[PDB]
Design a protein around this ligand. Structure first.
Ligand SMILES: O=C1CCN(C2C[C@H](O)[C@@H](CO)O2)C(=O)N1
Ligand SMILES: O=C1CCN(C2C[C@H](O)[C@@H](CO)O2)C(=O)N1
Ligand SMILES: O=C1CCN(C2C[C@H](O)[C@@H](CO)O2)C(=O)N1
Ligand SMILES: O=C1CCN(C2C[C@H](O)[C@@H](CO)O2)C(=O)N1
Ligand SMILES: [Zn+2]
Ligand SMILES: [Zn+2]
Ligand SMILES: [Zn+2]
Ligand SMILES: [Zn+2]
Lengths: 131, 131, 131, 131
């Protein structure tokens, strides 16, 4: 499961999105250390605050199944450049993924940006800050 | 899969919760029309706003897999009476579940309250309100 | 400050809304026991999850100023019937307003529905449930 | 109103926080181009997802009043180093503040980190990505 293949997983996951308000579909594929893939997509709500993102859908799915060791996360959307995870997703990612996990961002036209969890949100607010 | 059995599913799902800040674990089990069960649990974050609930974890998991027809949702937590879904969950439920879906609420001591999606959030804000 | 006058306050507050994504403006006016009025409006974000509602904007404003005793909350939007607070707002309302506070819901055509905080979200999840 | 004075404003705003669940109070002070200061503080909810942060409380307050031109934002909390805005706040900040606005982060022991909005969340997801 290289990043190329993980991207195709996120592209497929994108087609499952429920986004009738923004008409903006997002897909994500999370790869565990054991090689298992969890797909995620954004799921909207008439009350915008309750919309959930593809990145978080995939992570929530994994953690709920007991999988908490990851190696890579691919995210895709029909944006101008590689899709940029929103702050809420970066925050959840910084909590649920170890700082070494690779984050692969792409769009639907071959644009690819790769960065680590730490780079996605440097100095992220964490539990250590609470105590 | 009766409500008794769906409750045991939610009780198991509760043990998967990642809740190091509140130490309050919640479990949920969503039953589709075809009899498939999706488990969900709350997943917290040092930045409280980003915490996700068991009800929504289960629903997000189902919808992302392509399952959008449900019949029942069980929710469980160690509360005094049947656990009460927070407003955000009721909002997502009212969007992703048809008004006839049965919502079963319970705690860890046999308290059981049953209600429909419509009753969970009567006159819920919806897409019809946007247009 | 009767409900009629508080409604006009919410109608004015609605014109301050920043809602370029939904084009759906909402207004709210919160009346304290001492007769002070706090206006609120929805404020959106390209990343939908981060949108904030009029009801919560008004409440957040009041609480931050040290005002925590309220008597009435008016909410208005261009909906078919009285605007329905989303679950997230009902949740925050049930926490920050005592159960006796009156919630006045209306649209832009004279539709008016009045209910108490308790009625807005009966048996709302609360701190008592955490401990 | 230099950053030193804006910090004292955020320190005062911190004392208004309603944070009975985390016992972690945060303060913020937003300075407009015209020299007006809006204070903000975190406001929690038994249902963690609904908690709101100091940064966003201040911004929501300003925007609702019609003030949309800012020059600086100070944030303070009792953290080990300068308090780090959570992803949700950085997201709202990148939307409501122009990329040149100065963000001043500090704790209660003189630690000070200064950065621009762009630096707070480089390449933030924006409306341009939606269309
Ligand atoms: O973090 C990224 C950016 C945001 N989108 C979302 C949620 C929402 O349904 C839509 C518009 O913001 O894209 C994602 O799904 N992931
Ligand atoms: O809707 C219900 C009530 C809220 N809890 C949550 C999320 C959070 O991690 C914890 C404390 O609010 O319980 C749920 O998981 N489901
Ligand atoms: O609770 C009510 C219903 C929801 N809207 C919002 C937030 C968002 O900007 C827009 C579309 O959901 O209306 C409110 O402002 N208040
Ligand atoms: O962005 C910063 C970091 C997070 N906190 C919050 C919200 C919550 O009440 C508490 C614990 O996460 O700190 C803030 O208020 N601002
Ligand atoms: Zn996101
Ligand atoms: Zn919930
Ligand atoms: Zn709302
Ligand atoms: Zn924050």
């Amino acid at each position: 499961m290289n990043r190329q293949e993980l991207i195709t997983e996120a592209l497929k996951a994108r087609d499952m999105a429920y986004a009738p308000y923004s008409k903006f579909q997002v897909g994500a594929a999370l790869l565990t250390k054991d090689g298992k893939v969890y797909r995620g997509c954004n799921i909207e709500n008439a009350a915008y605050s309750m919309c959930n993102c593809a990145e978080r859908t995939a992570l929530f799915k994994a953690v709920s199944e007991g999988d908490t060791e990851f190696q890579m996360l691919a995210v895709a959307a029909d944006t101008p450049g590689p899709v940029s995870p929103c702050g809420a997703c970066r925050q959840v990612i910084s909590e649920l993924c170890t700082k070494d996990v690779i984050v692969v961002l792409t769009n639907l036209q071959g644009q690819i940006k790769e960065m680590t969890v730490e780079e996605l949100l440097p100095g992220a607010f964490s539990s250590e800050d609470l105590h």
